[PDB]
A paper describes a structure:
To gain insight into the structure and function of RPC5EXT, we determined the structure of its individual domains by X-ray crystallography. Of the two tWHDs, tWHD1 is the most conserved while tWHD2 is absent in Caenorhabditis elegans and Drosophila melanogaster. The tWHD2 structure revealed a dimer formed by domain swapping. This arrangement is likely caused by the crystallization conditions and, in agreement with this hypothesis, SAXS data showed a monomeric conformation as the most likely in solution. Nevertheless, the two possible conformations of tWHD2, compact or elongated, suggests a degree of flexibility within this domain. Thus, one possibility is that, analogously to A49 tWHD, the RPC5-tWHD1 participates in an interaction with the upstream DNA and bound transcription factors, thus stabilizing the human Pol III PIC. In addition, the Dali server analysis retrieved similarities between the individual WHDs of RPC5EXT tWHD2 and the WHDs of cullin and cullin-like proteins, which are involved in ubiquitin-dependent proteolysis. On the contrary, RPC5ΔtWHD2 and RPC5ΔC were rapidly degraded with RPC5ΔC almost completely depleted after only 2 h following cycloheximide treatment. Several abundant phosphorylation sites have been identified in RPC5EXT, which, together with the evidence of structural similarities between RPC5EXT tWHD2 and factors involved in targeted degradation, suggests the intriguing hypothesis of an RPC5EXT-mediated layer of regulation impacting overall Pol III abundance in response to environmental cues that may have evolved in higher organisms.
Pol III is a multi-subunit complex composed of 17 subunits. The TFIIF-like RPC4/5 and the TFIIE-like RPC3/6/7 subcomplexes are Pol III specific and can be regarded as built-in general transcription factors that play a fundamental role in Pol III transcription initiation and termination. A notable exception is the subunit RPC5, which in metazoans encompasses a long C-terminal extension (RPC5EXT, ~450 residues long), whose function is currently unknown. The RPC5EXT is formed by two consecutive tandem winged helix domains (tWHD1 residues 259–440; tWHD2 residues 556–708) connected by a 115 residue-long flexible linker.
Residue numbers in the entry:
A (entry chain B), B (entry chain A): 554 to 708
Write the structure that this text describes.
């Protein structure tokens, strides 16, 4: 079957705006071409990607167009005048920490997998290794293969 | 001393939990004593601060007590068994960015002071230079003493 483009575009747009926050369509297209250089031949993003699809991906990913009023005599191109910005950053680190703390309301120590499973069940199956690693680094210490809240191990 | 006790203690507790996330009372007291070592004689925080007031300040700041079930045979002291945790970061990055972005919906370029004043008016005087510097670094570029959204200067 066909290999759809939307998820691949979204991953690129999300990485780009989380890093840079504000950029023009011109810069987004430049960065997209650099992204293409990293992809293997046969990838779906080598064909049939319009500027419209890129803009729709930006708006689908919690970014907004900022209607900056360029001066009358500007030489900036249309793409150089179209400005997008990260609106909501989507950092759910507070919520992950709250789920972990709820575990330790009922447990002194647990396996990593128990934490991962609880987070996945509560917060979503797309939870990343980086997000779990962060909440563990912030809140916990491991001893003997078990995970404790910081400062609660008595070795 | 020159400043109010609870206000000063609250500032210390907030900064400490934003850095450490999870602390026992024992560890919080250790960190407090390290803090006192840095302060000038006559500072209000050399006043008697009871453990109860310290805990009350943590709880009043929005940190939560975590009722971790310590094992029956633990040798942890009572203060080592009282666990507290940051519930919300207080990261207001998105809101500051949205204030700034609305400035550039009506302006191509502005002075830094204009952005600062707008942030102060919308958020309040409780914006650290660190937050203002961050929102400027994330969204903007300076050229000739004026501030623009990233990517919009025709350099």
């Amino acid at each position: 079957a066909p290999t759809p483009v939307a998820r691949e575009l979204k991953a690129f747009v999300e990485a780009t705006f989380q890093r840079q926050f504000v950029l023009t369509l011109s810069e987004l297209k430049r960065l997209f071409n650099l992204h293409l250089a990293s992809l293997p031949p046969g990838h779906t993003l080598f064909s049939g990607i319009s500027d419209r699809m890129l803009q729709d991906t930006v708006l689908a990913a919690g970014c907004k167009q900022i209607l900056v009023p360029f001066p009358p005599q500007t030489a900036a191109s249309p793409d150089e005048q179209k400005v997008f910005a990260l609106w909501e950053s989507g950092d759910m680190s507070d919520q992950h920490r709250q789920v972990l703390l709820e575990i330790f309301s009922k447990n002194y120590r647990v396996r990593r997998n128990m934490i991962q499973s609880r987070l996945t069940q509560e917060c979503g199956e797309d939870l990343s290794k980086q997000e779990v690693d962060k909440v563990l680094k912030d809140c916990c210490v491991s001893y003997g293969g078990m995970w404790y809240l910081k400062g609660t191990v008595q070795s």
